[PDB]
């Protein structure tokens, strides 16, 4: 050193780091990219829990993003930003357990509240290095310390032979946990306040956050949580041990493979063989289902999330939860016949029935009939436009909106302070068709404040809008309350409650309060469908 920027040199438990000065719109920020937090989970380590990173010597360079965890890459719409922005932007590798830190520049003098981002991607994809997760805006504008980690996805992160020692399951959640511990031990070196840590994630990220809420050893590692468009409860976020055992042994067969022998065989397989086959192990033709997800092991998760939220004590928990306007549309074009991004996707009644079997793969015939009867517009039963929109609402309601409504409810009834939103603004820059509305994932760029970057062609109102969202999020992280304690000229955001069920709309207009998160329809999914299914 001596010739370097003295504000970029930091020591953590594993050694010395050199960060980087980044340009944000309103000034510079500090970035420490690709910090290892675990021993590479490679070779004999594959499928195993993460082991803490052993200290290194010299100054570890932390100026660039590290490898993305080995994963399936979606190639439905090539060169189409719509799906590309989610694709891995660094080299695929099993050596991928690294994390990233953004702080103000120079680093804060007093302890600053920390936000930890946990990306989604169906538990089979995702990376912390994507542009939409860029932490420079929250750090520069709100003065936040923002942390994000890679965790193992797909088989590498979630293949389980429940009970075995070599593939216990949930190791991707354990990766996340190890990084939360790393933050607890090391974040103060950056001016971060270990005693004010807020988790936030979207979709499988949000489900992940929920697992941590529900898993005791994770609870000491954070104080508040934001779940965007995902919950630990619901149809997709977990599988039973039996079902996970099934998929794991099926996949083993598909690649040419006593638990020990089976796992050892799997470990000799190229990463790409596992990826090439992971999608072939699902029990039905479906959308919004994923082969390798968290398992109810009776360890990380001692019971089903459903049980744990019904009987949990959430006294000291502040939670912010929400959905986008059109949770269902995005998935339709991938797996349901008749739907496309390239046309208006007007479907027939026949395709609607077929779509319901795919979107509710676990449904008996009677259950699927109830879904169809509930969602049919009996004044216009054959109308292509309603049917298309109904299909979207079926998928979005079953998978996100109702699980979220259930989660908000159970948590509130049991001590948690809960805030709920519905995000309703469609980005002016959006490359999907109008009929898809505001799809899954497209609020993220606003919360991270990308519209503050002038080169991105957002509208001025979209700039002002992103700034509000950043304040809601950072206020909530600071205090457990989205509301600005001073500015009372702005409408207030009420806690969500079982009694009143209030949540706010997030769009270009000032906050507006509403009551009931699809209450009537969610009574169907949350209270009735279970009973009808088991009978």
Swiss-Prot record:
Keywords for the protein's UniProt record, in alphabetical order: Cell membrane, Disulfide bond, Glycoprotein, GPI-anchor, Hydrolase, Lipoprotein, Membrane, Neurotransmitter degradation, Secreted, Serine esterase, Signal, Synapse
Catalytic residue list: 203, 327, 440
Record localization: Synapse; Secreted; Cell membrane
Topological category with respect to the lipid bilayer: Peripheral membrane protein
Paired cysteines (S-S): 69-96, 257-265, 402-522
Note: Synapses usually contain asymmetric molecules of cholinesterase, with a collagen-like part disulfide-bonded to the catalytic part. A different, globular type of cholinesterase occurs on the outer surfaces of cell membranes, including those of erythrocytes. This is the catalytic subunit of an asymmetric or soluble form of ACHE.
Subunit and partners: Isoform H generates GPI-anchored dimers; disulfide linked. Isoform T generates multiple structures, ranging from monomers and dimers to collagen-tailed and hydrophobic-tailed forms, in which catalytic tetramers are associated with anchoring proteins that attach them to the basal lamina or to cell membranes. In the collagen-tailed forms, isoform T subunits are associated with a specific collagen, COLQ, which triggers the formation of isoform T tetramers, from monomers and dimers. Interacts with PRIMA1.
Protein name: Acetylcholinesterase
Gene expressing this chain: Ache
